[PDB]
Amino acid sequence: HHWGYGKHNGPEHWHKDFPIAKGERQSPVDIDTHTAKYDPSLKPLSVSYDQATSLRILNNGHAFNVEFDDSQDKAVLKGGPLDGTYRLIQFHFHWGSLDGQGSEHTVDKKKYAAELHLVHWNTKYGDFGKAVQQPDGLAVLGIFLKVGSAKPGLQKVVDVLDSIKTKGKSADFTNFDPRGLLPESLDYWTYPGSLTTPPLLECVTWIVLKEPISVSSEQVLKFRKLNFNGEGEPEELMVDNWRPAQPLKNRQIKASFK
Ligand SMILES: [Zn+2]
């Protein structure tokens, strides 16, 4: 009876195994654009992805992760609200069963069709496993997906999904450039939060980009053909793998833009 996104093991149950689910800095949250505080001291984001080395794509039973070589400062995030250098380790998405839901964060209660999370860890902690134990251990860049025109830089991901249909399957996935997933503008909101899946640790500086990317209906439909289950188990489509918004509690969302 592992955690998941079903009626009997979904997010409203996670607190029984992970009591931090009811914590003070849980994610995602609704971004109220009118009460977010413009902070002129926030610096522009510095995304240096030109030397990124993707390795593999994996269906882990809750999403698919594209994993990167994080043994050197190859693909790094700096600047913005961050102190120090954060290395890209993986990206993954959350998506819905319908185009009107799927994102984890919302903007003035608006849901997007999907949300991309680029996960980075603070190099001062030496490895990802140590970083998750620290309040400044991770920085996650969150990008919304809306349905419209196709995103050509996403198609290489979409085309390999047939090879990792079920939980535990992995495939080599080299030479993927994540710059093809970024919007034109890097204006952002930021707040302190958590991982949105168990163990729900409160270790994340969230950086949520204001500008969504557009993907086509055909691209997102291919996400919905993945399976939560392993091969030979009954088929459960991997859809609605998003956590609902959590209370903001004593936190302020800051904006890099007016
Ligand atoms: Zn995520």
Swiss-Prot record:
Pfam families: Carb_anhydrase. Changing residue 65 to H: Enhanced proton transfer. SMART domains: Carb_anhydrase (SM01057). Changing residue 140 to F/Y: Strongly impaired activity. The record marks 5, 60, 65 as: Fine-tunes the proton-transfer properties of H-64. Substrate binds at residues 196-197. GO terms for molecular function: arylesterase activity; carbonate dehydratase activity; cyanamide hydratase activity; zinc ion binding. Changing residue 60 to D: Strongly reduced activity. Changing residue 60 to T: Reduced activity. The active site is at 62 (proton donor/acceptor). It is found in: Cytoplasm; Cell membrane. Changing residue 197 to H: Higher affinity for bicarbonate. Enhanced proton transfer capacity. Changing residue 119 to K/R: Strongly reduced CO(2) hydrase and p-nitrophenyl acetate esterase activities. Activated by X-ray, histamine, L-adrenaline, L- and D-phenylalanine, L- and D-histidine, L-His-OMe and beta-Ala-His (carnosine). The record marks 90 as: Involved in the binding of some activators, including histamine and L-histidine. Changing residue 60 to H: Reduced proton transfer. Its cofactor is Zn(2+); Co(2+). Changing residue 62 to W: Impaired activity, rescued by 4-methylimidazole (4-MI). Impaired activity, not rescued by 4-methylimidazole (4-MI). Changing residue 65 to Q: 2-fold decrease in enzyme efficiency, as determined by kcat/KM ratio, and efficiently inhibited by chlorzolamide. Belongs to the alpha-carbonic anhydrase family. It is linked to Osteopetrosis, autosomal recessive 3: A rare genetic disease characterized by abnormally dense bone, due to defective resorption of immature bone. Osteopetrosis occurs in two forms: a severe autosomal recessive form occurring in utero, infancy, or childhood, and a benign autosomal dominant form occurring in adolescence or adulthood. Recessive osteopetrosis commonly manifests in early infancy with macrocephaly, feeding difficulties, evolving blindness and deafness, bone marrow failure, severe anemia, and hepatosplenomegaly. Interacts with SLC4A4. Interaction with SLC4A7 regulates SLC4A7 transporter activity. Interacts with SLC26A6 isoform 4 (via C-terminus cytoplasmic domain). This is Carbonic anhydrase 2. The lineage of its organism: Eukaryota, Metazoa, Chordata, Craniata, Vertebrata. The gene is CA2.
